[PDB]
Amino acid sequence: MFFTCGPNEAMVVSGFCRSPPVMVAGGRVFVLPCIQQIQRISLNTLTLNVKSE
Amino acid sequence: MGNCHTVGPNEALVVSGGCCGSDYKQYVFGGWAWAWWCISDTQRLSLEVMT
């Protein structure tokens, strides 16, 4: 089955015959849903209010 | 009966017992493993940052 992510995210795929996990930023990957797992990370910027007192 | 277990890079999976012997630990850190219901148990630990 095909899985897609925007450029704002990276997809990590681990599983059968994919022991070194495949990492794709903004693309499509063919995955076995019951024998391989997909995880994601947001590439967005965070505007942090860094207080000091 | 046996199960196929998929593991993320963030996890250490330890499987005790298996195709290579009796008295041993099988070491996994992402990817996958094959486990026999009564010949090999499966236990995981997170490798993430803790602050």
Side-chain angles (χ1 to χ4, degrees), chain A residues 1-27 29-39 41-53, chain B residues 1-43 45-51:
Chain A
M1 192 172 186
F2 271 110
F3 299 91
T4 54
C5 75
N8 294 52
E9 295 180 352
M11 296 184 301
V12 183
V13 180
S14 63
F16 188 86
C17 299
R18 301 186 183 172
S19 287
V22 186
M23 303 151 278
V24 180
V29 182
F30 188 85
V31 186
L32 281 57
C34 301
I35 283 177
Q36 294 169 348
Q37 276 172 350
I38 189 165
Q39 290 159 336
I41 282 176
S42 174
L43 310 179
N44 291 324
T45 44
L46 309 176
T47 188
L48 299 174
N49 289 336
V50 192
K51 288 199 177 186
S52 63
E53 289 95 325
Chain B
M1 289 183 173
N3 299 347
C4 297
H5 289 283
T6 61
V7 193
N10 289 45
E11 311 136 40
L13 171 71
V14 189
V15 180
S16 56
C19 312
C20 303
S22 56
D23 314 3
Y24 88 107
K25 303 168 179 179
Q26 184 153 338
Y27 329 92
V28 188
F29 318 95
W32 87 288
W34 165 257
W36 317 94
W37 179 48
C38 290
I39 275 167
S40 60
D41 183 32
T42 62
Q43 297 173 16
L45 197 55
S46 174
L47 309 183
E48 296 159 59
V49 164
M50 184 41 53
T51 187

